[PDB]
Amino acid sequence: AISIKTPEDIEKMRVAGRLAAEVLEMIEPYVKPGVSTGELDRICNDYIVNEQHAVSACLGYHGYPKSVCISINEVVCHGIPDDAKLLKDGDIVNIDVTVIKDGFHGDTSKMFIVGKPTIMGERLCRITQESLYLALRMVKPGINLREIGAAIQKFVEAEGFSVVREYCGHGIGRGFHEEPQVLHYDSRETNVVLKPGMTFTIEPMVNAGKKEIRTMKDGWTVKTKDRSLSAQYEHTIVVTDNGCEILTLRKDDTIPAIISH
């Protein structure tokens, strides 16, 4: 039940994906000690609406109250911007951005470290990005999606870290979240053979301590159960005849947009 995208659809996703990447490029010099997450969010929302002529897919999405997700330290995902929440030296911060343009979605996220890195922070974020690039390099027609989760998990566990189970990447298009579910670990539950024209995200969430998570009073916010740090990165891709094209590359990404086999 995955439907593929036409060349006209894929080009609309290049546009939306580039816009999402550019938000993350735009926000970087604002991410420093003492800025609030609430300020960061309004800066991004203004940019999307009034500079990019587009709209945040997050804003109002099934109740989600802000325009981007901002998760710090032990928060794994869905962290909600708050004018009371000030960044501090050593914090690790994810910002996930999803833009809709001309009816198509582009979703991406990265980590930013505030001030001077802690040793554990620097290593966690690096391992997490490397786990994603390892997965991107596997994508091509005829492989099973299950291989990708298995590879991510093996790599991450060899570094003495854990892979979050309950949240995952996803198909993406005219909708924010479509088939398939993209697990970051090995599971019987995955059985999907990639074909050209499929679009989806990969977005591993890696914990420093154990894998288990808990859900907060606000509903949305997910933290680590052992209160260790957690990190994530994401890109949106399209499967090509011989590999993949990454649709959300930033200038600070260290991999080409096309991967060929």
Ligand X SMILES: C[C@H](NC(=O)Cc1cc(F)cc(F)c1)C(=O)N[C@H]1CC=C[C@H](c2ccccc2)N(C)C1=O
Residue 234 labelled as part of a binding site: yes
**Using the rule CB under 5 A, is 181 a contact of Mn ion?**
no
Q: Which helix (H) or strand (E) holds 12?
A: helix 7-27
**Using the rule CB under 6 A, is 77 a contact of ligand X?**
yes
Q: Report how far apart, in Å, the C-alpha atoms of 82 and of each of 32, 35, 63, 69, 216 are.
A: 16, 11, 16, 11, 15
Looking at 13, 43, 168, 202, which residue binds ligand X (CB under 6 A)? 168
Looking at 26, 61, 186, 226, which residue binds ligand X (CB under 6 A)? 61
Distance CA 132, CA 55 (A): 26
Looking at 96, 130, 178, 253, which residue binds ligand X (CB under 6 A)? 96
Strand order in the sheet with 230-232: 162-163, 205-207, 230-232
Q: With CB cut-offs between 5 and 8 Å by kind, which of Mn ion, ligand X, none does residue 177 bind?
A: ligand X
**Using the rule CB under 5 A, is 240 a contact of Mn ion?**
no
**Using the rule CB under 6 A, is 69 a contact of ligand X?**
yes
DSSP assignment of 187-231 equals -TT---B--TT-EEEE--EEESS-S-EEE-TTSS-EEETT---EE
**Using the rule CB under 5 A, is 178 a contact of Mn ion?**
no
**Using the rule CB under 6 A, is 75 a contact of ligand X?**
no
- Give me the residues that bind Mn ion (CB under 5 A), please: 107, 201, 203
Return binding residues for substrate.
78, 177
- Give me the residues that bind ligand X (CB under 6 A), please: 58, 61, 64, 69, 77-78, 96, 167-168, 170, 177
